[PDB]
Amino acid sequence: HIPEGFSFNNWFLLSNDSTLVHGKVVSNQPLLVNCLLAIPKIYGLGQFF
Amino acid sequence: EQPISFVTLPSFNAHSFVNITVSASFGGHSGANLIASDTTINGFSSFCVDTRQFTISLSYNVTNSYGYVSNSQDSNCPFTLQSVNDYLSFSKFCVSTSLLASACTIDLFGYPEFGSGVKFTSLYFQFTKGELITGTPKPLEGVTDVSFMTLDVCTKYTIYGFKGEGIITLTNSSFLAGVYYTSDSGQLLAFKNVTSGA
Amino acid sequence: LASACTIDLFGYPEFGSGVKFTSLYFQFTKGELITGTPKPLEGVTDVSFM
Amino acid sequence: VVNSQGAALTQLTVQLQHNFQAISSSIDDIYSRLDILSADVQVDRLITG
Amino acid sequence: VCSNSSNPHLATFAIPLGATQVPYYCFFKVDTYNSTVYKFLAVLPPTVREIVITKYGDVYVNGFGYLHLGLLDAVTINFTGHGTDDDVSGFWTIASTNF
Ligand SMILES: *[C@@H]1O[C@H](CO)[C@@H](O[C@@H]2O[C@H](CO)[C@@H](O[C@@H]3O[C@H](CO[C@H]4O[C@H](CO)[C@@H](O)[C@H](O)[C@@H]4O)[C@@H](O)[C@H](O[C@H]4O[C@H](CO)[C@@H](O)[C@H](O)[C@@H]4O)[C@@H]3O)[C@H](O)[C@H]2NC(C)=O)[C@H](O)[C@H]1NC(C)=O
Ligand SMILES: *[C@@H]1O[C@H](CO)[C@@H](O[C@@H]2O[C@H](CO)[C@@H](O[C@@H]3O[C@H](CO[C@H]4O[C@H](CO)[C@@H](O)[C@H](O)[C@@H]4O)[C@@H](O)[C@H](O[C@H]4O[C@H](CO)[C@@H](O)[C@H](O)[C@@H]4O)[C@@H]3O)[C@H](O)[C@H]2NC(C)=O)[C@H](O)[C@H]1NC(C)=O
Ligand SMILES: *[C@@H]1O[C@H](CO)[C@@H](O[C@@H]2O[C@H](CO)[C@@H](O[C@@H]3O[C@H](CO[C@H]4O[C@H](CO)[C@@H](O)[C@H](O)[C@@H]4O)[C@@H](O)[C@H](O[C@H]4O[C@H](CO)[C@@H](O)[C@H](O)[C@@H]4O)[C@@H]3O)[C@H](O)[C@H]2NC(C)=O)[C@H](O)[C@H]1NC(C)=O
Ligand SMILES: *[C@@H]1O[C@H](CO)[C@@H](O[C@@H]2O[C@H](CO)[C@@H](O[C@@H]3O[C@H](CO[C@H]4O[C@H](CO)[C@@H](O)[C@H](O)[C@@H]4O)[C@@H](O)[C@H](O[C@H]4O[C@H](CO)[C@@H](O)[C@H](O)[C@@H]4O)[C@@H]3O)[C@H](O)[C@H]2NC(C)=O)[C@H](O)[C@H]1NC(C)=O
Ligand SMILES: *[C@@H]1O[C@H](CO)[C@@H](O[C@@H]2O[C@H](CO)[C@@H](O[C@@H]3O[C@H](CO[C@H]4O[C@H](CO)[C@@H](O)[C@H](O)[C@@H]4O)[C@@H](O)[C@H](O[C@H]4O[C@H](CO)[C@@H](O)[C@H](O)[C@@H]4O)[C@@H]3O)[C@H](O)[C@H]2NC(C)=O)[C@H](O)[C@H]1NC(C)=O
Ligand SMILES: *[C@@H]1O[C@H](CO)[C@@H](O[C@@H]2O[C@H](CO)[C@@H](O[C@@H]3O[C@H](CO[C@H]4O[C@H](CO)[C@@H](O)[C@H](O)[C@@H]4O)[C@@H](O)[C@H](O[C@H]4O[C@H](CO)[C@@H](O)[C@H](O)[C@@H]4O)[C@@H]3O)[C@H](O)[C@H]2NC(C)=O)[C@H](O)[C@H]1NC(C)=O
Ligand SMILES: *[C@@H]1O[C@H](CO)[C@@H](O[C@@H]2O[C@H](CO)[C@@H](O[C@@H]3O[C@H](CO)[C@@H](O)[C@H](O)[C@@H]3O)[C@H](O)[C@H]2NC(C)=O)[C@H](O)[C@H]1NC(C)=O
Ligand SMILES: *[C@@H]1O[C@H](CO)[C@@H](O)[C@H](O)[C@H]1NC(C)=O
Ligand SMILES: *[C@@H]1O[C@H](CO)[C@@H](O)[C@H](O)[C@H]1NC(C)=O
Numbered sequence: 001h002i003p004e005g006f007s008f009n010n011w012f013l014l015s016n017d018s019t020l021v022h023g024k025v026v027s028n029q030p031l032l033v034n035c036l037l038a039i040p041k042i043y044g045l046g047q048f049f
Numbered sequence: 050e051q052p053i054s055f056v057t058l059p060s061f062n063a064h065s066f067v068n069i070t071v072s073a074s075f076g077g078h079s080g081a082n083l084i085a086s087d088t089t090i091n092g093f094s095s096f097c098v099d100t101r102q103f104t105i106s107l108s109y110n111v112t113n114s115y116g117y118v119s120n121s122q123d124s125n126c127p128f129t130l131q132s133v134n135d136y137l138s139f140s141k142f143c144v145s146t147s148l149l150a151s152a153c154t155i156d157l158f159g160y161p162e163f164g165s166g167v168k169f170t171s172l173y174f175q176f177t178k179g180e181l182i183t184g185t186p187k188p189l190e191g192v193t194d195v196s197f198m199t200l201d202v203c204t205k206y207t208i209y210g211f212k213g214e215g216i217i218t219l220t221n222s223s224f225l226a227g228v229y230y231t232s233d234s235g236q237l238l239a240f241k242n243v244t245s246g247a
Numbered sequence: 248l249a250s251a252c253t254i255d256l257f258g259y260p261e262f263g264s265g266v267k268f269t270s271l272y273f274q275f276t277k278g279e280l281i282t283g284t285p286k287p288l289e290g291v292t293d294v295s296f297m
Numbered sequence: 298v299v300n301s302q303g304a305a306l307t308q309l310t311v312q313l314q315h316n317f318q319a320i321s322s323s324i325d326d327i328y329s330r331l332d333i334l335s336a337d338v339q340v341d342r343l344i345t346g
Numbered sequence: 347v348c349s350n351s352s353n354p355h356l357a358t359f360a361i362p363l364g365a366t367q368v369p370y371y372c373f374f375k376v377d378t379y380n381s382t383v384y385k386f387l388a389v390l391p392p393t394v395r396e397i398v399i400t401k402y403g404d405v406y407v408n409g410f411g412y413l414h415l416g417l418l419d420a421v422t423i424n425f426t427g428h429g430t431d432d433d434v435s436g437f438w439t440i441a442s443t444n445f
Binding site: 058060061063101179193225226228243244245246 | 360389
Binding site: 010011012013014015016028029030031032033034035036037038039040041042043044045046047048049 | 421425426
C-alpha cells in the first residue's frame with residue numbers, strides 16, 4: 001500500500017479519454033506494487049525486463 | 050457564411066492520393082448486360098492507408114453503345130466517400146475487394162437506360178477510430194501545423210472529432226494535465242494548446 | 248439451409264493479410280436427447296453425477 | 298428539506314446526456330454523416346424521449 | 347527512435363526532420379523479420395513527466411494513453427555506461443505497478 005503524505009506530483013488518473021478537474025470516483029488503476037527501484041544505475045548495460 | 054476553424058493534434062503535412070477505379074462494359078453483351086467489371090484501388094484488390102493526410106479519388110469507366118448510365122451506390126456503413134472527404138480524422142483504415150470481418154461492404158449500381166440496371170462489386174473497409182488518418186478535399190501546401198483557427202468570431206469548427214458552431218477565446222486559467230475538457234452533457238468547453246499550452 | 252447458424256474462418260499467412268475459408272451451417276433446438284461433452288463419460292450407467 | 302430542495306435537477310442533465318437507440322447523441326454528426334430520412338427517425342425517438 | 351535535424355536516413359524516409367533541433371521528431375522503425383518502415387509518432391512536447399507501460403499494449407505517458415497495441419511480452423533498455431547516463435538519469439524512481 002501507499003504510505004501517506006506522498007505528493008504523487010507526477011501521478012495522474014488512468015483515463016483513456018475525457019478530463020476531470022475535480023470530483024471523486026472508485027475505479028481500477030495500476031497502483032498495486034510488486035517491487036520498487038529508484039535512481040537506477042545499470043540500465044545503460046542493456047538491462048532487460 | 051461561416052468561417053471555418055480546424056484544429057487537431059499539431060503536426061506537419063504528409064498527404065497521399067489514393068485512387069479507386071471502377072470499369073464496366075455493356076456495348077457488346079446486351080447493351081444492358083455486362084461484359085466485364087474491373088475495380089482497382091491504386092491498381093490493387095486491397096490496400097492500407099499510409100499517410101496521416103490523404104484523399105480518395107474515384108474514377109468511372111463506361112463502355113456501351115448508348116453511352117448513358119445512371120449510377121447509384123448502396124452502403125451498409127454510416128460513411129460515404131463524399132462525407133469522409135470532409136476532414137474526417139481517424140486512426141486506422143484498409144480496403145479490400147475480398148470479404149473481411151468488421152469491414153463495411155459497399156456496392157455500386159449503374160442503369161444504362163437500356164431497360165435494366167446492374168450492380169458491379171462489393172468493397173470491404175475495416176477501420177478503427179482515432180487521430181492518425183484524416184481525409185481532406187485537398188492537401189495543405191508546405192504546412193508544418195495543418196490546424197487552422199481564428200478567435201473573436203463565431204466559427205464552424207471540428208476539434209479532435211468534435212465539431213460544432215461557436216465562438217472561441219483564450220483564458221489564462223492553466224492546468225498541468227488534460228488537453229480537452231468536456232461538459233458533463235458532452236460539450237468540450239475549454240481546451241489547451243498542445244504545442245504551447247495556451 | 249433453412250434458418251442456419253453461419254460460422255466463417257479467417258487465416259493470416261503472416262504476409263500481412265487475412266482471408267476467409269468458408270461457411271458452416273447448423274440447425275438445432277433446445278432439448279435433452281443429445282449433449283456436447285468435452286470428454287466422454289465412462290464407467291457410468293446413469294450419466295447424472297451430483 | 299434542504300437536502301430535498303437540493304435535488305430534482307441533476308437527473309435532468311442525466312437524461313439529456315444519453316444516446317437512446319441512435320448512432321450518436323451529436324445530431325450534427327449524423328446530420329453531416331448521413332442523409333435526411335434516417336436521422337429524422339432517430340431524432341424523433343430522441344425528442345420523444 | 348528520435349532525431350533533431352540529424353537524420354542519416356530518416357531524412358530519406360520522410361522529410362529531413364519536419365522541425366529544427368529543439369523539437370525532436372521521433373518514429374518507430376517497424377523492425378521485424380521481413381519489413382522495416384518508419385511510422386511518425388510525434389515531436390518532443392514541452393514537458394514529459396512520467397511513463398507507464400501496460401501488458402495490454404498501450405503505454406500511458408503523462409496520463410493520456412496515446413496508442414494501444416497487442417499484448418506485450420518484454421522490453422530491454424540501454425543508454426551506455428558513459429558516466430552521467432545514471433547520474434542525470436530521468437528515473438528518480440521506477441515501480442512494478444499492478445491494477
Ligand atoms: C479505455 O478503453 C480501453 C479499450 O477497451 C480499455 O481497456 C480495457 O481494459 C480492461 C482492463 O484490463 C481489459 O480487460 C481485460 O481483458 C483481457 C482480454 O484478454 C483476452 O483477450 C485477448 C485478445 O484480445 C486474448 O488473447 C486473451 O487470451 C484473453 O482471452 C482479459 O484477459 C483481462 O482479464 C482480467 O480478469 C482476469 C480474471 O478473469 C484476471 O485474471 C486478469 O488479470 C485481468 O484482470 C481483462 O478482462 C480490456 O480488454 C481492455 N479493452 C480492450 C479492448 O482490450 C480501458 O479500460 C478503458 N479505460 C481506461 C481508463 O483506459
Ligand atoms: C475505363 O475502363 C475501360 C474498361 O472497362 C477502359 O477500356 C480498356 O480497358 C482495358 C482493360 O483495363 C485497358 O487495356 C486495354 O486493353 C485493350 C484490349 O485490346 C483490344 O483492343 C485492341 C485495340 O485497341 C486490339 O488490338 C486487341 O486485339 C484487343 O481487341 C487494348 O486497347 C490495350 O491493350 C493492348 O496492348 C497490350 C500491351 O501491348 C496488348 O497485350 C493487348 O493485346 C492490346 O493489344 C489496352 O491495354 C484500357 O485501359 C482500355 N483500352 C481502351 C482501348 O480503351 C477505358 O479505356 C477506361 N477509360 C479511362 C481509363 O479513361
Ligand atoms: C498555439 O496555437 C496557435 C494557433 O492557435 C499555434 O501557434 C502557431 O504555431 C506555429 C507553429 O508552431 C507558428 O508557425 C510559424 O510559422 C512561420 C512561418 O511563416 C513565416 O515563414 C517565413 C520564415 O519564418 C517568414 O519569413 C514569413 O514571413 C512567414 O511569416 C515561422 O516563421 C514561425 O516561427 C516563428 O515563430 C515561432 C513561434 O510560433 C518561433 O518559435 C520561431 O523562432 C519564429 O520566431 C512559426 O513557426 C505560428 O507562428 C504560431 N502562431 C500563430 C498565431 O499561428 C500553435 O497551435 C500553438 N503554438 C505554437 C507555437 O505552436
Ligand atoms: C434420484 O436420486 C436418488 C438419490 O441419489 C437416486 O437413488 C440412487 O442413486 C444412485 C446414483 O445416484 C444409484 O446408484 C446406481 O446403482 C445402480 C444399481 O446398483 C447396483 O447395481 C449392480 C447390482 O449388482 C452393481 O453394479 C452394484 O452392486 C450396484 O450397487 C448402478 O447401475 C449404478 O452404476 C453402476 O454401473 C456403473 C457403470 O457400469 C458402475 O460404474 C457402478 O459401479 C455401478 O455398478 C449406480 O451405482 C442408486 O441405485 C439409486 N437408488 C438407491 C440408492 O436406492 C436415484 O437414482 C435418482 N434418480 C435418477 C437420477 O433418475
Ligand atoms: C525482435 O525481438 C526479439 C526479442 O523479443 C528478437 O529475438 C531475439 O533476437 C536475437 C537476435 O536478433 C537473438 O539472439 C541471437 O540468437 C541466435 C539463435 O537464437 C537463440 O538465442 C538464444 C541464445 O542467445 C537461445 O537461448 C534461443 O533458444 C535461440 O535458439 C544466437 O545464435 C545468436 O548468438 C550468435 O552470436 C553469439 C555472440 O557471441 C555467438 O556466440 C553465437 O554462436 C551466435 O553466432 C544470438 O544470441 C535472440 O536469441 C532472440 N530471442 C528471442 C527470445 O527471440 C528478434 O530477433 C527481434 N527481431 C529481429 C528481426 O531481430
Ligand atoms: C534532474 O535534473 C536537474 C536539472 O535542473 C538536475 O539539477 C541540476 O543539474 C545540473 C547538471 O545536470 C547542475 O549543474 C551543475 O551543478 C554542479 C553542482 O553539483 C551538483 O549541484 C546541484 C545542486 O546545486 C545538484 O543537484 C547536482 O546533482 C549537481 O551534481 C556544478 O558543479 C556544475 O558546474 C560545472 O559542472 C561541470 C563540471 O565539469 C562543467 O562542465 C559545467 O560547465 C559547469 O561549469 C553545474 O553547474 C545543477 O546545479 C543542478 N541543479 C539543482 C538545483 O540540482 C538534477 O541533478 C537531475 N537529477 C537527476 C536525478 O536526474
Ligand atoms: C491515385 O490517383 C490517380 C489515379 O488516376 C493517380 O494520381 C494522379 O496522377 C495524375 C498525373 O500525375 C494527376 O493529374 C495531374 O493533375 C494536375 C492538376 O491536379 C495537372 O496539373 C497535371 O498535368 C496532371 O494532369 C492527378 O491529379 C493524380 N490524382 C491523384 C488522386 O493522385 C495515382 O494513380 C494515384 N495518386 C497518387 C499516387 O497521388
Ligand atoms: C489573466 O491574467 C491575469 C493576470 O493577473 C489574471 O488576473 C486573470 O485571472 C487571468 N485570466 C484568467 C485566469 O482567466
Ligand atoms: C543498445 O543496445 C543495442 C543492442 O544491444 C545496440 O544496437 C545499441 O547501439 C545500444 N545503444 C547505444 C546507445 O549504444
